[PDB]
Amino acid sequence: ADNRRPIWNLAHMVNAVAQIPDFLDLGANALEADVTFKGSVPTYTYHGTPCDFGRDCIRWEYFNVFLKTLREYTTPGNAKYRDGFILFVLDLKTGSLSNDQVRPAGENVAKELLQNYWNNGNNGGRAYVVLSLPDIGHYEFVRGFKEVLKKEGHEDLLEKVGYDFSGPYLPSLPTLDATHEAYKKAGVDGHIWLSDGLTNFSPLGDMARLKEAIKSRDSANGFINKIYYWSVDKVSTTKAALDVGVDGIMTNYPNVLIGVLKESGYNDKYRLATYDDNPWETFKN
């Protein structure tokens, strides 16, 4: 019945477990954590400096512990279960990996999620997971990731997994075509999130990039399911993001979007996504 676009309110840079309920309390239905690697081994949730103004940059957790904690918050029946916490983005810091490390990294992240988040399929967390890779050329990470899940007999868990290949930002930003191709190379034919944020390096081209992405998402044979925009932290920019048609707002202050979604106008066009909003489904209305 509801014709409003479901919005993911993604708490930005939530790398310490103590912060999780705090961001969820502010109204986030999703969070983003930065997954650091030591070689192919996903090691910490940790962003580091520099980071957004008004944020401490160095909060962290062991990756395993972070995932186990996400599981608690997203397992129905758990004492800590938050039914409003529906998705998390793993901002996978694979940018320094050698080529030989990319597939094993994907395998290692799969193993981590399987063991720690999905608990080997034994009543795991129900939240959707977006694997956000910073290089379209890292699609072997996804191939390895998928291969682990399939080999361990949990291919069904890929229902819960989405992908966002962005970058690299040098020597140039990938075009949408290139991105789409990267997905095909990864064997990804759905569950695709596109983010737009980090680079405000070519303002008029970035305005164009966002609109191009939105148009692509909303196009006949589009491949992008959701678009999220990051560090939207003010009412004005939150409204702008919603009004341009994004599905996801990544923000340091999830309460902002909550307030905006209450507002006249906004409240008849956009709504906070719930678990029953398939994050892999392109919004049409």
Interface residue list for its own copies (CB under 8 A): 36-41, 44, 46, 48-53, 56-58, 60, 93, 95-101, 169-171, 197-199, 201
Q: Among residues 31 and 157, whose Cβ is nearest to its own copies?
A: 31
Q: Which does 208 bind (CB under 5 to 8 A by kind): its own copies, Mg ion, none?
A: none
Active site annotation includes 180? no
**Closest CA relative to residue 224, chosen from 179, 268, 173, 172:** 179
Full DSSP string of 135-170: -GGGHHHHHHHHHHHHHTT-GGGGGGEEEEE----S
% helix, strand, coil for the chain, step of 5: 40, 20, 40
Q: In Å, what is the CA distance from 88 to each residue of 67, 136, 153, 276, 285?
A: 10, 20, 23, 15, 25
Strands, DSSP E only, in 166-256? 193-196, 226-230, 248-251
Asked if residue 212 belongs to a known ligand binding site, the reply is: no
Active site annotation includes 191? no
Q: Among residues 90 and 188, whose Cβ is nearest to its own copies?
A: 90
Q: Which does 79 bind (CB under 5 to 8 A by kind): its own copies, Mg ion, none?
A: none
HSE (side-chain half, CA atoms, 13 Å) at 10: 31
Asked if residue 100 belongs to a known ligand binding site, the reply is: no
Q: Among residues 5 and 47, whose Cβ is nearest to Mg ion?
A: 47
Q: Which of residues 54-113 bind Mg ion (CB under 5 A)?
A: 91
Q: Which does 34 bind (CB under 5 to 8 A by kind): Mg ion, its own copies, none?
A: Mg ion
Asked if residue 91 belongs to a known ligand binding site, the reply is: yes
Q: Among residues 77 and 171, whose Cβ is nearest to its own copies?
A: 171
Which residues are identified as catalytic? 12, 47
Q: Which residues are annotated as a binding site for Mg(2+)?
A: 32, 34, 91
